[PDB]
Structure formats: structure tokens, C-alpha cells
Amino acid sequence: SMEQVAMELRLTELTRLLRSVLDQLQDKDPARIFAQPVSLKEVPDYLDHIKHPMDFATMRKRLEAQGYKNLHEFEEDFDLIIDNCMKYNARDTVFYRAAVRLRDQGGVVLRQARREVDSIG
């Protein structure tokens, strides 16, 4: 159907906008603390602590399969990255502080992305 195609064009466009959001968020992580999944070889207890791990590479795989239906889903995954880090690591650690900084800086990007998603539809 033509409707299914128009819907798919919208998903495709959302994916385009989310890809750019993703790149801007990841630039706020020049240390690359959040680039890849936490290694279960290097933190073998991790899954006892964190039930839903997340990282920028895993978000990117989902993105490129057009697996984000709306901005809310994409923000849920970004929030996991931050929130998982702030629970597993103590307040005095470079990791925790990096998550705080990513959260604060990412907020600005996300604020405008919500306006653009509403605006373009």
C-alpha cells in the first residue's frame, strides 16, 4: 500500500534525525566511556547489578535497523546509558562524573530534537 510506504518514509526520516542526535550525543563523550558495552570478561558481576545494559554501539545497531519508532524509545536507551553508569559507579569516579556531564550536555540536544520531531511530525 501507499500508506505503508508514507509511514516508512516517516520512519526513515525519524531515523535520519535520530542518527544526527546520536552523533551529537556521542560528541559529548570524547573519552569514549559509553561507546561500547561494558565487558562481562572485565566486569564479570555486571549483570548482577545492571539488568538492562546499554551503550552507543548497541543504540546505533538498533537505529540502523530502524528499530526506534519514536523519540521516546531512543531517549529511554540514552537514559539507560547514564542511569546504569550512575548506579554501578560511585559518585567520586571518573565514570560517574562522565555520565553526569553527558546527561547535562545531552539535555540541550534532546530539548531541540523533541521540538523538531513535533515540528516536522
Side-chain angles (χ1 to χ4, degrees), residues 1-2 4-6 8 11-15 17-40 42-60 62-68 70-110 112-119 121:
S1 92
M2 195 53 237
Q4 292 303 319
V5 170
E8 291 160 357
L11 180 53
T12 292
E13 282 310 297
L14 174 71
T15 304
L17 184 159
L18 295 182
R19 191 181 295 116
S20 168
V21 177
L22 188 59
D23 294 333
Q24 285 172 72
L25 291 176
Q26 192 151 27
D27 293 328
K28 310 316 174 139
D29 177 32
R32 300 195 66 89
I33 292 166
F34 306 108
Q36 296 295 327
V38 169
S39 176
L40 303 178
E42 302 165 7
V43 188
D45 75 351
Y46 190 63
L47 302 180
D48 296 335
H49 293 271
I50 298 299
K51 299 304 178 196
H52 298 103
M54 198 38 62
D55 71 84
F56 285 129
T58 305
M59 289 192 63
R60 203 180 291 281
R62 181 162 168 195
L63 184 56
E64 294 310 333
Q66 305 192 333
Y68 298 112
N70 61 47
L71 184 56
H72 177 79
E73 296 187 340
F74 175 105
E75 295 171 304
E76 283 186 349
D77 274 353
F78 179 64
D79 289 330
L80 281 176
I81 293 175
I82 296 310
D83 287 339
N84 287 350
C85 188
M86 295 175 77
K87 288 169 192 77
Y88 190 85
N89 304 102
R91 192 158 48 255
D92 70 327
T93 59
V94 64
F95 304 105
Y96 180 113
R97 286 157 181 282
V100 169
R101 286 165 66 80
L102 182 61
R103 193 198 55 186
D104 286 350
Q105 298 200 269
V108 183
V109 173
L110 289 175
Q112 201 52 42
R114 157 60 60 207
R115 299 193 62 86
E116 282 165 331
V117 166
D118 292 1
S119 197

